[PDB]
Structures are given as C-alpha cells and as structure tokens.
Symmetry: D2
C-alpha cells in the first residue's frame, strides 16, 4: 500500500557515500577488496576494514565489518548540511520508521549520523560530518591498471517497484530510466541525486535484499583489466556477468562476487542527469538490448541471488515475496521471450536466453 508523502521536508541528499558490509572472514575479504581490487585502506583493526576509492576525500566508501552473517548493515547517503540530518530524522519518524541517531557516528570517520529502517526494510544512514582524508586522485604512483575511482551507486531488490519508486521520489530521487512491459508491470527503476544515472536503483524481486554496490573506473580498459587479473589469479569463476555495455544507463560494466557472494559492479561512462527535466527512458522488459546492449544473455543467478540486509539491531530482515511478474521468467524462463528488433521474429528468443 502506498507510502505517504510526509508534511516534514525531505533532507537534501547529495549522493551515495558508503556501504557497511558484514563479512565472515576479514582476511579473505581484505584480499579481495585490497589485493585483487586495489581499494585504499583508510583505517583497519581486527574487526573492521575502512576502504576508499582513488578520488575520494571523505573517510571511506566501504566498511567491512566482521560478523556472523554476511549482509548489508547500512547504505549511507551524505546530506548537504548538519541540519539535513535533523530533517532526515523528522521525515522518517513521520513515516513511522524506526530510527537511531548517534552524534559521534556508527563507524569511524563519520560524525553525527541517523540510521533508519526504511519503508522498504533497508538500513539507510544519513550523515553530514565526516573526517577528511588524503584525496588520492593524482597519486599515479599508486594507480592500478584496474583502479576503482569513485563509489557510484547501490542497487536494491524489492518486491513492489512502483511503491518504492514513489517513496524515493518524495525523498528527492528522480527516476532516470526504468523497465516496464505492456501489461502495466514495472521490473526496475533507476534514480538519482548527484548528476549521474543513479545513486540507488530498485530491481523487482523478493526483498529487502542488496543487489550490488557499484564502483567506477576512468576507462573501459580498466574494467577489462579486472577480468584479465581474475583470469591470472585463476578466480574467473568469481566473474558473474560481463563485461558489457548496459542498455539502461549506457555504462560499460562488470559484475563480480566477493568472498561472501556480495555482488560488486564495476561501472563507467554513463551520462549527465542534473537537469530537472532530464528525459526519462523506459525500456520494454522483452528488449534483449536493455540490460546488455550487445544482447549477451543475463545469467539466472543475476536475477535470483542477492545479499541479506540487517535491521538496526543487526538481525536479518525477513524477505517478502514478489507477486508481480518475474523479469527472469518473462525473458529467459521456459515461457520467456525477448527480441532484438521490436516486431521482428528474426533475432527473437522463445523459452531461452540469447546466443544459443
């Protein structure tokens, strides 16, 4: 049922800022994120690793926290002013959501912060205050052939996309692209605060689950190098999907799996969305160029697998089942369909994925 628009003003959200991920083996996770992927350590101890991308000046973009059950603990957005943390708290209380505020932060390098169990069951954090660190954007002495340069977005699995979309729109996120069919079903939506295609996105599925966290590279060859490195390390089985060109977003991309199966996307070269009348793009779910522009098939695991999320007590959120049609089933399942050219039988696929 619809989530009401509060009377209270929404906080001014700048961008996605960091994710806190619970991991089971801190050493194995460090090897993946630091040794394989080259993220930069801002702080570490025996319980947590704080990591940042090459161009970041805030304390971190990723916190790995040792715990018993691998899951998303918080997806954090930075707000414009300290007063926006107050606005966030008032807004979510009006929404009837559980909130927790700590003046000294939940993780190192973040000050006054509000965590909330949002209407879709996700742990959101809003903060302004953060400890500045050395911005490594010109440290070409450190630069990796696969260098991850920015945190770009999150992607959330939720059972009712329109319900979630309206809520995020009220919160100030503008939809840039979406996937629908001719029967009124929405399968996915992308929405932004900062001037890129998205800061978060909704993928229709059983939820709440975290689909992925995405980092940017400068160039397409940097993504290719990550694949090449993973072949050399003989861990190509942890490449899930890609590399490719997205239809939706137009970005070059790759999806890989961390030691706890948390999915990480590598992403580059989407477009500017900062104008308020930025044209919304709607794709048909049966268009075989919507996810991979080259028509490469989307592996079923990409649709079915995603990370658990925690509530404010650190317990796993119960999963609610999607009743709307499944993107997997309608495109690549036994009764699925996709096309290369709308209305052309040639280059269409019935009851199977593209390319054989």
């Amino acid at each position: 049922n619809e989530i009401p628009k509060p009377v209270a003003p929404a906080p001014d959200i700048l961008r996605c800022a960091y994710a806190e991920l619970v991991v089971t083996d801190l050493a194995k996770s460090r090897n993946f994120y630091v040794d394989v992927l080259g993220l930069h350590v801002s702080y570490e101890d025996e319980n947590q690793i704080y990591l940042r991308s090459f161009e970041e000046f805030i304390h971190h973009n990723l916190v790995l926290t040792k715990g018993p059950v691998a899951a998303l603990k918080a997806m954090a957005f930075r707000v414009r002013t300290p007063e926006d943390v107050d606005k966030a708290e008032a807004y979510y209380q009006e929404l009837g959501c559980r909130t927790e505020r700590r003046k000294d932060g939940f993780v190192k390098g973040i000050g006054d912060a509000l965590r909330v169990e949002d209407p879709l069951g996700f742990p959101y954090e809003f903060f302004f205050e953060t400890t500045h660190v050395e911005r490594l954007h010109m440290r070409y002495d450190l630069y990796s052939a696969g260098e991850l340069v920015r945190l770009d977005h999150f992607n959330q699995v939720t059972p009712d996309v329109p319900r979630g979309r309206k809520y995020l729109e009220d919160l100030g996120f503008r939809v840039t692209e979406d996937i629908q069919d001719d029967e009124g079903t929405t399968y996915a939506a992308w929405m932004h605060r900062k001037g890129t295609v998205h800061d978060t996105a909704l993928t229709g599925g059983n939820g709440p689950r975290l689909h992925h966290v995405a980092f940017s590279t400068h160039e397409k060859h940097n993504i290719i190098q990550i694949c090449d490195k993973m072949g050399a390390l003989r861990i190509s089985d942890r490449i899930e999907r890609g590399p490719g060109r997205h239809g939706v977003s137009n970005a070059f991309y790759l999806y890989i799996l961390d030691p706890d199966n948390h999915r990480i996307e590598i992403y580059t070269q989407d477009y500017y969305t900062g104008d308020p009348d930025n044209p919304t793009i709607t794709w048909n779910v049966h268009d075989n160029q919507r996810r991979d522009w080259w028509g490469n098939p989307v592996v079923p695991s990409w649709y079915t697998e995603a990370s658990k999320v925690l509530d404010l007590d650190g317990n796993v959120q119960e999963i609610i089942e999607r009743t709307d049609d499944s993107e997997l089933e309608v495109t690549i399942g036994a009764d699925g369909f996709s096309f290369t050219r709308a209305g052309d039988e040639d280059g269409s696929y019935h009851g199977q994925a593209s390319k054989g």
Copy 2:
C-alpha cells in the same frame, strides 16, 4: 571595488549550457566544428549554426552566429526553474547591471531568457526553457573516434581574480582549485555548480575576454584522435597547446583554435566536486606541474590571446588592463621562476620555460 552581495536571492544555476560565438565566415566555421570536430547540427541557416554534443538533450551547446567581428556574444547557464530567470533579473539589477529580457529567447531553441552585462563586463545568459532534441548518447552508429560528448565549461580572462571570485561565490559557484603565490596574488580560480571541477573559471589577464569553451570526451584516446586527425588534415598549426594532463583539475586536455582564433579545449576525467565542503586546492604559481602535470611548457599565446566579448548592443567591450602580476612573467618571463620540487634547484627554471625553451 568589491562587488556587494545582493539582498535578492541568487538564481539557482544548474550548469553551463551553451555559448554563442560570433564568427566571420560561417562555412569555414561549420567546417571546423562539424567536419573536423564532429559536433551535431540541431539547426542551421545562412546566418547561424546550432550545434550539440553527443549526450546533450537541450537544443544546443554552441551557436555560431555570422557577424562582422568575431567575439563571444553570450555565455549561457541553465537555471533550475522558470522562476530562477526572474531571480537572475532581480539579482543583476540589484548589482546595477544592464539586463535584457526576451520571453521567446535570443536564439532558436531557447525560450524565456535573460541576458546581462555582468559586473566583470561579460555577457551572461540565464534561461530555463529549451526545446528538447534527440539525445544521441547511444547513437554509436554516429560516434566519431574523437567524439565530443558534453559541454564542460567556460574560461574567462579578467584583470582582478579575487573581485570576480567573490561575485561568483555569492552567485553560488564554489571554488574548487586556484593558483596563488606567497605574495598575496591570485592568478586563476575554478568554480562549479554542477558536480565537476568547474562550469566557469577566471584566468588573470586583460579583460573581459573569453579564454575558451571546453568540451569533454569519454576517454583520453578520443583527445589523441583529435590531434591525429588535425595532423592528417594538415592543420596541426591549429593545435595550440597539449595534449597533456592538467595539475589543476587533473583532466586530460587539448587546446585548439577555430577559424576566428576562438580557443576550444577538449577535456576528460576530472573529479567529483558536489559535496559542499569539497576540499579547495591551491597551487603555487611557480609549481611547474600546476598547469601541465608532466611539466611541459605553457606557450605564451595561451596567456596572452583570448576572444573579444560583446555587450548587449553587440559592440565589443573595452579591455581593462591587469595590474596584478602576470602568470606568464612570473613563471616563464625574463625574471620568471618555476620548480619541479619545492625547494630544489635541480629541475628548476630561471628566466625561461621548461624543457629547453624560451619565449619567442
């Protein structure tokens, strides 16, 4: 001489949107911007060419207007709402500036628009309404090896950088980087509204003049290809400076000259500046990696040459001489100095440019 902060609220500016350049030979200019550089035509007739970048959805990023004297006619910024055009009007009127309002626009594909003679003598346009066109961002069947994908920024030559900087800060532009010395002189500042290093910038010098308009590419090889193509067309004399890596902005770059000597920068891969406490970077004017990170010398024309700007009547604005120290003189001139490593004489340059060159 300080420009006061108006009581009237500043318009909410989104980004640089387009420039209108007066050109003397429309066909020669079209050859440069369309045939050489690959910009996309939104409209053209005997008097004007309207051009846009690969990823743009507003009507245009560049208007070429035939006229007797080559000059910048307007640098245009898009504002967030129609109401912001009224705000801009009230703001500049409070500053004591001349303003002109046209409900149906000054150029095709722009609606209600305000043009102003700003306090630094520059013709700024503010608008919201614009005719949307086909966004070509996935038209890879059109994509050039040198494709210009966005309009990124303007750069303005002005004699008193602190005076201009304060005015633009009150307008909502935050300074991301600057160049100063230890004697209190500011030589240049970069300032933004959209989340990149800048939408405009001030370069110290006699002004008002337009230093350049900058377009972005996706990747560094795209900029390399523009150079390569200019060599194949045997117009390498129109490559002024570059390609290089900037210190300030960290962008890969190239400067080229159009048929009327309007300078165009091609630019890629600067960083995100959208957070309100984005760290402001100050480089010393004597640091030889500040403009070109690799230490390549900055050709003197880059410091001395820039385009005329017009007032609202279309007449050239009179030039006011800079009295602050000259970046050229203090770095590559007779009594100039630059260093590679602060405090190291090794890799320093005295009275000449880096890499074995002197001023011609």
Copy 3:
C-alpha cells in the same frame, strides 16, 4: 598411412596471409556490412565484386566479395616472398598430387601471377607475389573510424584431423605457436604462423573443409568495444555471435560477428611476438575453462558447429568429411563434458553444462 608426405620440392617462402575471396549472395547487403558497418576501405568495385582493404594495408586488398549463387570461401590467399615462389608453390602442390590452376594475370583484380590449388585438406589456397600497390591509409586519421580495422591478421580452418593438417602446414613452413590437447592424446585445435604473430592460419577440429573465420585486427581494445556498441545502435546485436573477450590461446582481445551470409569475422588485437625460431609452444588442456575465453565465459555451441562452405577450383562446394576424433564441444559443454577453472578443483568446475 594417409599422411601428406613432404615433397622433395622446396616449399614456397610464405610471408603472411594476404586476402580472402568470399562468395556472397547479395552484394549490396554485404557492402553495407563490410563498408558501412565495419568501415573497410574500397580498392575497387563494380556490379559483381567489391575489393576492400584495412587501414594499414598497401597491397591492393585484404577481402574480395564476389557475387555468386552459394555463399562460400572461394580462396584464402597468402603472399609469397618472390615471383619465383609462385613457381615453387606450383611444383610443391603438383608433387602432393593436388589440382592446381595458374593464371599469369591473376584471378582477381590487383593480383598478378597467381596459383590456386585444391590443397590436401580440400581448401582453396592462393599463392601470389605481384600485387598493385595502393595508398597506405595508416596515417589517414581523417578517415579513421572508432572501430577501425587496421590489418588482416589470420584465417581459421575447420578440418577433421588436426595432426594430419598440422604436419602438412609445418612442412610448408608454418610453425605451431599454441594448441589444445587432452591427456588421452587428442588434438582439438592448433595455431600456426609465418609472420611474427600468433598465427596466419589455424586448424579447428571439426567436419571439413569449412572456413571457420577471417580475422582483422584493431589498434586497441576500445575499437572492438565500439564495433559491439555500433551493432547495438544498428539493432543488429543478434549478429554478435561470441564475445567480446580475452582469449586464453593467443592472449588477444576478440569478438566474433556474422556477415549477411553467416561468414564469421573475428576482430582481434594484442597478441605477442613469435618470430624467434624457438618461440615456446603453449599447450592447453581441452577441459581448461580459461583456454578459449580467459575470463571463463562460455563458448556458444554455434561457434563449434557452424562454419562456411569452401569451393573447389570449378566453384563447386567441397564435400565435407566428418571428424572421427573426439569433439571439443562434446567433451567440454555436452551432456558428458566438463571444464574446470582450477585443475583438480570441483569448485568452479562445470559438468554436463557450460560455465556461468
């Protein structure tokens, strides 16, 4: 045995692969693919043929498209070092008992004295020295496409008995650089060279003679990406067969696409130097899931089963001989096949299924 005995006559000194003549059924449709989509440069054309070359070529052409009733390879041509090498080629193939045809004025425009042969594997080979030089476009950056094809790199031939063909090609002066074998002693594929790259031709085990593909190179990996992107924009992504990827064998970045008659074209870049005579030969195990695609992406079955007909010297289709040796498709992705990411490790292995 059915070995191809080494002639006493000296082998012609072969420089490199030089051009292919492909018979096509609709010349205008083929022109649109090779010129408009792929950007090859016209060296001559009329109502029956189109002659095309790559960006860095100075000989007359790398590809001749000839209108005919049945799409097929008509000749795969190698340039020899001197005019006398055409004589050597004729004596060599005559000793092998092969049908030969010598045209002192060439078979196609821009080639002079030329010998065509029905080789012992049933392939139409041409050997020539004389060719009309044309403008080398290597610095014509005013013409350069975002997907520019810069050189002709190699051919790949489907033949039933790889060792038989390999020894024949070795006698002809081709050195094997890489191959794929199993522990039981079966050879599935071999790559072999004259010029200093991984190959000028290659043998893929299968029913033959059939032409598997013709390969062109690009300068950089982004040029191959652009070809894919362009094909998506033209809504012909169904003509992208496999890739883009990193090869295991050759280490080259690659893509396979299909022309209007289903002739397969590979785009290829950045293999390694093989010109030293003791260049180390690399043998991969057939069950290694990084041998073909280094990133472990699956090889679609059509890549193993589909290939172009070849013609005899009368222009008739050559009869096909079925492979009796084990099938690479069957032993890797068929019902009883398997592959591994790490030898000996069931984690990352695939059984009776392809990867991913």
Copy 4:
C-alpha cells in the same frame, strides 16, 4: 670511406634483443627501471641487474652493469641459428673489425656470443643461445598501468647517415622511413629485420653515441600513465619529450631520461613492414609533422644529447663530428625553418620552434 659488402654471407638477424648499459649507481638505476618503469627482474647481484619486458621469453632485454662511466656497452641482436654467430664472426673479420668470441657468453643467460666494434664504432653483439624464462604475457596479476611489453628498437647517433645505412642494408636491414632535404642531405633513417618499422635507426650527429633504447606498451594510455606516474613522483623533469604521435613510424611515443641520462623511449602502434617491397617513406626535414605529427616542437636536447658508447676494452669510443647539415639548425635554430603545409607561409616557423618557443 664507403664500407664494402663482404663476400662472406651476412648473419641472419632476427631482431634487436637486449642492451647492456653501464650505470654509475646500481640502486638508483634499479629504482628507475624496476620501481618506476616496472621491468621484471631475471637476475640481480651487487654488480648487475638483468631485466625483461612483460612478453619476453629470452633471459633479458636490458642488463644494467655497474661501472665508472655510464655508457652503452653492447647492443645485442639475436640471430636465427647457432651457425649465424660463426657467420657474424666471418662477416666482421672480412670488414676488418675487432671481434671477440665467448662460447659461454658475456652476460648471464646468453650462451655463445660475438661482440664486435662495428664500422661505425658501435659495440654490437650477436648470439643465438639464451636461457628461456617464464613468459609473463598473461600475468595480469603483475601488470602495471604503464606496463612495458616488448623491447622494440635501438637508435644510434652517427655522423654520416648514408655510409651507415649502406652497411646496415648489406647486413640485411631494410630501410622503412627516412628524413632528407631537397639538396640531397640525409638526416635520419629507420631500418628493420623483424616486421616492425625498425630494430635500429640512425640519427645524424656526432658519434658513435647511443640515442635511445625503446620499449613498447600495448596501448596509448599506458604511455600516458608513465607520464602521470612521473608527475606523482615529482620527477617530471626527467620527461624529456612527449608524449606525442610520431610522423615517421606513426607510433605513439614518449622520451624519458634514466639516472645516468640514458634516454628511454616508450613506443606503441607502428605498422607491419615484413613484405619485401614494403613502401619506403621519405620525409622532408622542414616538415614540422615528421617527428611529432601534431607539430609539437622537438626539444633541442633531443638533437644534442646522447650516451657514450664503449669499445671492447670498456673504454669510451672517440666521437667523430658530423659535417653534413644539422637537423636542429635547419629546423629550429635562428636560421632554421619548418612548415605545416609545404609551400605555405601560414603555419610556418622561421628562426624558432613551433607553437611559440625559441631555443633556450
């Protein structure tokens, strides 16, 4: 003083294979070649460092030998068979050159080898036997953003280019490109054995001196990264020239200087030359696109500075002065000139370099 063609057959040369450079401080040289540039160690001790590129399978491409005077000690070419070492010995003996044969090599990982003081005063080595090592071409776990993938070529400074060219042609090198003027002077020539633009090249100047050793990258961005890294390390003063696109060779390039001022070129994407009638390309010396296609000026040090070379006793070879015209002088000197378009004054430079600089 022409060098006659021997009756004895030339050795069959495959390619350039390695250079032995004498360096004065082994640790500082190691920092440059291993830490800055990322070359791979095949062997090292207190006296020498043996280095190879990413795709090499022979033992090394570069030997750094500690010694009192920095210099080229040997430029080594691999020959096709063991018997070609005997052919090289007979060939150079017929030429009247000093030869030294060591059945177990001069440096580690090379077997039977011949070193000669060649007719141009250069120390050449010919060998077949070399210890194979792990070919790192797919070791993407090691791959750096600036990875050097192959040894491509040498470049030699010699006073009489036609005299040297003839000698190298008799040895089997074929000329691919050269630079001449209308009055019949030759300034430079490029020549090959393997199917690239060159394995060695001759630059007119006082000699024998070693101009540079060149390594390849996969892509242009790899060269850009080397520049970026040198800026981050605050050693941009060791970037001599570039990055650029060459006219001659069409390769993307960069020139940097090691701790002893030995010049290293980074290079990529030249073209195939393996056909025996490969078209030769001759450029006019006044063509400002011949060296840098984009017309960027050639720094005077590029023309004047080069490394000493040693004789077989390890003593520095005496230098012979060039008497033919100087490329520096005829192009960028006070009486030089260059053009963008032949015959066009627009885009031409007289008495100075392109882009607005004169000689420092």
